[PDB]
Each structure stands twice: as structure tokens, then as C-alpha cells.
Amino acid sequence: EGECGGFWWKCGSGKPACCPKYVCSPKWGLCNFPMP
């Protein structure tokens, strides 16, 4: 059920939004932290 964006969740054209903590990288279509 839960398909939130974790440390590495495929995002882009046809995907869900990342969690409040994770975000979709501009270079790579994956949900991860904003920065180490």
C-alpha cells in the first residue's frame, strides 16, 4: 500500500511524490534525502 518516496524511490512522469523528508532528485528520478 504505502508507496511513499524513501531513500531511493523511482520518481518522474507517472510516479508518486516523495515523503516530507525525501525528495525527487533533479538529475536522477529517485526519491532520496536533500543532502548527506
From Swiss-Prot:
Subcellular location, record wording:
Secreted
What GO molecular function terms would the record report? Answer: ion channel inhibitor activity; potassium channel regulator activity; toxin activity
Record bears the keyword Flavoprotein: no
Enumerate the Pfam families for this protein: Toxin_12
Expression across tissues: Expressed by the venom gland.
The record's listing under SUPFAM superfamilies reads: omega toxin-like (SSF57059)
Reading the lineage from the top rank, the first entry is Eukaryota
Q: Recite the UniProt keywords alphabetically.
A: Disulfide bond, Ion channel impairing toxin, Knottin, Neurotoxin, Potassium channel impairing toxin, Secreted, Toxin, Voltage-gated potassium channel impairing toxin
**Under the cellular component aspect of Gene Ontology, which terms does the record hold?**
extracellular region
Task: Please list the disulfide bridges.
Answer: 4-19, 11-24, 18-31
* Transmembrane annotation, as ranges: none
Record carries keyword Transmembrane helix: no
Q: Which family does it belong to?
A: Belongs to the neurotoxin 10 (Hwtx-1) family. 44 (Jztx-4) subfamily.
Extra info from the record?
Negative results: has no significant effects on Kv1.2/KCNA2, Kv1.3/KCNA3, Kv1.5/KCNA5, Kv3.2/KCNC2, Cav1.2/CACNA1C, Cav2.2/CACNA1B, Nav1.5/SCN5A, Nav1.7/SCN9A or Nav1.8/SCN10A channels.
Domain notes from UniProt: The presence of a 'disulfide through disulfide knot' structurally defines this protein as a knottin.
Role summary: Gating modifier of Kv2.1/KCNB1 (IC(50)=5.1 nM), Kv2.2/KCNB2 and Kv4.3/KCND3 channels (IC(50)=39 nM). Acts by shifting the channel activation to more depolarized potentials by stabilizing the resting conformation of the voltage sensor. It completely inhibits opening of the Kv2.1/KCNB1 channel at negative membrane voltages and dramatically shifts channel activation to positive voltages. May act by partitioning into lipid membranes and then by binding the voltage sensor paddle of the channel from a place within the membrane.
Q: What is this protein called?
A: Kappa-theraphotoxin-Pg1a
Q: Which organism is it from?
A: Chilobrachys guangxiensis
